[PDB]
Design a protein around this motif. Structure first.
Motif, mmCIF file in Angstrom:
data_model
loop_
_atom_site.group_PDB
_atom_site.id
_atom_site.type_symbol
_atom_site.label_atom_id
_atom_site.label_comp_id
_atom_site.label_asym_id
_atom_site.label_seq_id
_atom_site.Cartn_x
_atom_site.Cartn_y
_atom_site.Cartn_z
ATOM 1 N N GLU D 47 0.821 -1.207 0.000
ATOM 2 C CA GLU D 47 0.000 0.000 0.000
ATOM 3 C C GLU D 47 0.857 1.260 0.000
ATOM 4 O O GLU D 47 0.546 2.228 -0.705
ATOM 5 C CB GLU D 47 -0.962 -0.016 1.186
ATOM 6 C CG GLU D 47 -1.960 -1.145 1.104
ATOM 7 C CD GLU D 47 -3.037 -0.855 0.077
ATOM 8 O OE1 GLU D 47 -3.729 -1.798 -0.353
ATOM 9 O OE2 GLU D 47 -3.137 0.317 -0.352
ATOM 10 N N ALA D 48 1.938 1.271 0.782
ATOM 11 C CA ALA D 48 2.821 2.433 0.796
ATOM 12 C C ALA D 48 3.411 2.689 -0.588
ATOM 13 O O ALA D 48 3.549 3.843 -1.007
ATOM 14 C CB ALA D 48 3.927 2.238 1.831
ATOM 15 N N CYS D 49 3.763 1.623 -1.311
ATOM 16 C CA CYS D 49 4.244 1.780 -2.679
ATOM 17 C C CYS D 49 3.147 2.323 -3.589
ATOM 18 O O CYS D 49 3.389 3.225 -4.400
ATOM 19 C CB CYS D 49 4.771 0.450 -3.211
ATOM 20 S SG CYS D 49 6.286 -0.122 -2.416
ATOM 21 N N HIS D 115 11.593 -11.071 -2.808
ATOM 22 C CA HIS D 115 10.997 -9.864 -3.363
ATOM 23 C C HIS D 115 11.009 -8.646 -2.451
ATOM 24 O O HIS D 115 10.493 -7.598 -2.853
ATOM 25 C CB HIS D 115 9.558 -10.129 -3.818
ATOM 26 C CG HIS D 115 9.477 -11.004 -5.025
ATOM 27 N ND1 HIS D 115 9.754 -10.545 -6.295
ATOM 28 C CD2 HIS D 115 9.102 -12.297 -5.163
ATOM 29 C CE1 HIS D 115 9.594 -11.532 -7.160
ATOM 30 N NE2 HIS D 115 9.190 -12.603 -6.499
ATOM 31 N N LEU D 116 11.572 -8.738 -1.244
ATOM 32 C CA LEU D 116 11.672 -7.538 -0.422
ATOM 33 C C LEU D 116 12.632 -6.539 -1.045
ATOM 34 O O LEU D 116 12.467 -5.325 -0.874
ATOM 35 C CB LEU D 116 12.124 -7.896 0.995
ATOM 36 C CG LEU D 116 11.103 -8.561 1.914
ATOM 37 C CD1 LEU D 116 11.798 -9.177 3.125
ATOM 38 C CD2 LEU D 116 10.011 -7.589 2.337
ATOM 39 N N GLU D 117 13.626 -7.034 -1.782
ATOM 40 C CA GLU D 117 14.549 -6.181 -2.518
ATOM 41 C C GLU D 117 13.844 -5.359 -3.591
ATOM 42 O O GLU D 117 14.349 -4.298 -3.978
ATOM 43 C CB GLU D 117 15.648 -7.058 -3.126
ATOM 44 C CG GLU D 117 16.703 -6.329 -3.928
ATOM 45 C CD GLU D 117 16.399 -6.334 -5.410
ATOM 46 O OE1 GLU D 117 15.730 -7.280 -5.879
ATOM 47 O OE2 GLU D 117 16.827 -5.391 -6.107
ATOM 48 N N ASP D 118 12.689 -5.820 -4.077
ATOM 49 C CA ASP D 118 11.903 -5.014 -5.005
ATOM 50 C C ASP D 118 11.334 -3.777 -4.316
ATOM 51 O O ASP D 118 11.281 -2.697 -4.915
ATOM 52 C CB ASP D 118 10.795 -5.864 -5.625
ATOM 53 C CG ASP D 118 11.343 -6.972 -6.507
ATOM 54 O OD1 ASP D 118 12.459 -6.802 -7.043
ATOM 55 O OD2 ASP D 118 10.661 -8.005 -6.672
ATOM 56 N N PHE D 119 10.888 -3.919 -3.065
ATOM 57 C CA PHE D 119 10.516 -2.748 -2.276
ATOM 58 C C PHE D 119 11.700 -1.806 -2.092
ATOM 59 O O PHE D 119 11.573 -0.592 -2.288
ATOM 60 C CB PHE D 119 9.954 -3.176 -0.922
ATOM 61 C CG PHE D 119 8.627 -3.862 -1.006
ATOM 62 C CD1 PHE D 119 7.622 -3.356 -1.813
ATOM 63 C CD2 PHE D 119 8.389 -5.021 -0.289
ATOM 64 C CE1 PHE D 119 6.395 -3.988 -1.894
ATOM 65 C CE2 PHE D 119 7.169 -5.661 -0.367
ATOM 66 C CZ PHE D 119 6.171 -5.142 -1.171
ATOM 67 N N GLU D 120 12.868 -2.344 -1.716
ATOM 68 C CA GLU D 120 14.021 -1.474 -1.495
ATOM 69 C C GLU D 120 14.535 -0.882 -2.798
ATOM 70 O O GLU D 120 15.093 0.221 -2.797
ATOM 71 C CB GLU D 120 15.154 -2.223 -0.784
ATOM 72 C CG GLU D 120 14.835 -2.678 0.628
ATOM 73 C CD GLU D 120 15.980 -3.433 1.274
ATOM 74 O OE1 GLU D 120 16.374 -3.071 2.403
ATOM 75 O OE2 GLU D 120 16.545 -4.331 0.615
#
Lengths: 117, 132, 132, 129, 129, 123, 128, 130
Positions: D47-49, D115-120
């Motif tokens: 949601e933040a993204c 996929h947390l690296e996609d957020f970062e």
């Protein structure tokens, strides 16, 4: 948005109301800020939000400017549309908000700089 | 670390100066010059505390303060100050907010109450940080 | 507007308090309490000016001031204060910042210079604003 | 801008709380409370993204997104994020409907591990503005 | 119908885990993983109720719901739930937002202590069937 | 309208030895407001993570959330729903009828087994 | 009372599998003895499901979505070990294949090596 | 339909299976192996019967039954089965339940009354579907 519904619902439920602002995307959620002479009970404010939510058939975020952060008071002053209250109270709230925000930016800029690389 | 010591030192210097200028309290309420000195040294204590708090916030990356009073909330949420002390410092920020943004609606009875009973809140906040 | 009337009144009050407290100068560099009074009243003058600037910028939609300094630059780029007075007000804000937040690096001769020759920068700011 | 600064902070806080709570795995698939925390923090990240994307779409006047996935499609079509990162962020929109079970917990471990690296990577592109 | 039977099962399961994880308010105070668990299971409860409502609206051909909240009004307008429970279920719709958190934690506690029964009341009214 | 041709194509291009495709959500009854629910049967069960990935691939192509069900590993309850309310979009009639009676038979056996459990939780 | 009678059926059905499948000289050759073993394996399989469904029932562990789910619900609440859960669900699958549609090297393999799983399941359940 | 023709062969294959294992019936009621056989092959007939009932109920869009009974009931309610044959098979899947799941309250009389007079019931259902 039927602004009159918002105005009425908050006048009938908030004692000594002074300002109503519509802000956010509509000027997800309809974002509304109110200022009254007292801070509102946090639970009572959420419940009053849901009453507005039911009447507008949409999610509602009701912000009490007397207890809201400086950052979000600044946003209401910058982007908000006043729907109720006198011109004097709006200008008073702006000058207090805007000043406190420039002071807060001085205090915390080193923090924002470090978190934004 | 360099910056924290200096702030700590500033708080002590300002505390002492408040006490010396407020002396016995007798002529404080009837002389605007003493009021000015005490009020300006109280603001210095508050701002120095916020700078200490934000510096810790920054080095340990506890968050972005949304308001001045929140700098102390982030220390409390990570258990580095007790929350009774957090709320005392937050109350002191609100009085600075009043003394800065509104010159004349300060009630000086609050100011003398802070002097007489709440300056040790500064030294408790300072009593906790050092040991960390 | 009512807000500008009260800020102008506050600027007036504080200027005389500076004047009345600085008297002839013979004791100012000596006494910490007269330095505190003078410095605190300069801050109030600066804040009253900043609030006027923030109020005009918001209500005639010239922009959002990021800081107190840009609040005066936006008034200057819309030609409601002269550039020279904008920079004087901007440099008075900076001297206050050193005066309240880091007084042991404060050059009090600058404060004495400001007291003796630069208090009309405030009064020039009031004469412009008032002559809208 | 405060909206983008706080959303980036919210993403960072949740990514850390995900890593702290997941640990080495081990006990994760056996405590429903740590699964709930990870899952709800993944939604918070998504949601933040989406909020960052919609704020950029609006201030840069790229168009009006009709859906959460259209928020990232508008950024990719204006080359402010690459198409692979756009498609990775869309994938995570699907996570909303995984809270509402063990058929799915390896989906969650897959997302945590890969996929947390996609957020970062998305917030690194946004910080570079 | 399997759709409503399983939704009632998840609501019951979620109410149990909320009660189990919240306890007597013990340390739910400063431990972010049990608040996350409570918040996400309240979301699950809200979604299951909306889905039950939508299934009844469509099985009973009461109309097409225009919103998650309008889903409960259609049941209320045909008197299969009373108006106070309808409004209580609607104010739960708002919960899925404050997932995305400390003076909002009093909101959560408020719901845990006073509105769980609202979900329970809704499933026993549906068990009439 | 739902583009059932791109659903068919996308699944065919991504699922080896595909045999059945069903549309079965709200979209199969009247496209109400919502997941797109899609069930597939292939000769092998699909890798669960790979199946979630193809769901998001269809989700991107249809700009809506997608639930992709592998009938070879789905519950009896959910297999019954696919044959009851589902719309076949691909595959032979023989494979569809084989799947239906296998499902329907398994479901009536499960109803015999679990009825007392069902009765107790809804009374 | 339901569980005790089901355990009785499992014991007398297993003993009946063992008696009729003797040395296995002809199991593969005559079908009447295949029929007896297959139905008594089915009976054993059914009875375990009822025991499991009765336990899930008396403790509200969930609603089975499939026959295999009856054993998954007991394992997720630590009432059987997951190795035993997976073995019992393997038998559910063979009941399924026997009932709805059986290569019989599978039944000879279960008869000779996997009846213990029925007997371990009843030994656990009764232990609680 | 291939599903129909495969079941129907299953029914015919299992009826003959029933009839051969119980030729004379001297040792039927004391050797219960030949009856594990007859009970098994009996429910294969029932199972098979239920599957066409299920298969036809779905193709002709008469509803999806949730029980084997409802399957025969829907074909009777749409007049493709004679209704007492609906009961004659509803009673046969009921005999089968007790036969496999409760094998000690099995009268064993009806066993043989059904391989006696009611085994044809499978094969009127069988020609009625053809």
């Amino acid at each position: 948005l039927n602004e009159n519904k918002i105005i009425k619902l908050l006048r009938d439920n908030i004692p000594k109301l002074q300002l109503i602002y519509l802000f956010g995307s509509y000027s997800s959620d309809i974002d509304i800020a109110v200022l009254a002479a007292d801070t509102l009970d946090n639970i009572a404010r959420w419940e009053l939000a849901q009453k507005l939510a039911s009447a507008l058939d949409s999610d509602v975020d009701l912000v009490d400017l007397r207890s809201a952060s400086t950052v979000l008071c600044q946003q209401v002053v910058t982007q908000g549309k006043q729907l109720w209250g006198t011109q004097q109270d709006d200008e008073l709230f702006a000058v207090k908000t805007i000043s406190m925000y420039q002071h807060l930016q001085a205090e915390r800029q080193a923090i924002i700089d470090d978190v934004m690389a | 670390n360099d910056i924290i010591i200096n702030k700590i030192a500033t708080i002590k210097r300002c505390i002492k100066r408040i006490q010396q200028v407020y002396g016995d309290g007798s002529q404080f309420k009837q002389d605007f010059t003493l009021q000015d000195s005490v009020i300006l040294n109280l603001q210095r204590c508050c701002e120095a505390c916020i700078d200490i708090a934000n510096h810790i916030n920054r080095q340990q990356q506890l968050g972005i303060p949304q308001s001045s009073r929140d700098s102390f909330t982030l220390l409390a949420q990570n258990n580095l100050i007790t929350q009774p002390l957090s709320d005392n410092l937050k109350k002191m920020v609100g009085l600075r907010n009043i003394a800065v943004h509104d010159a004349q609606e300060l009630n000086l009875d609050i100011v003398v109450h802070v002097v007489q009973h709440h300056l040790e809140d500064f030294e408790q906040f300072i009593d906790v940080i050092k040991a960390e």
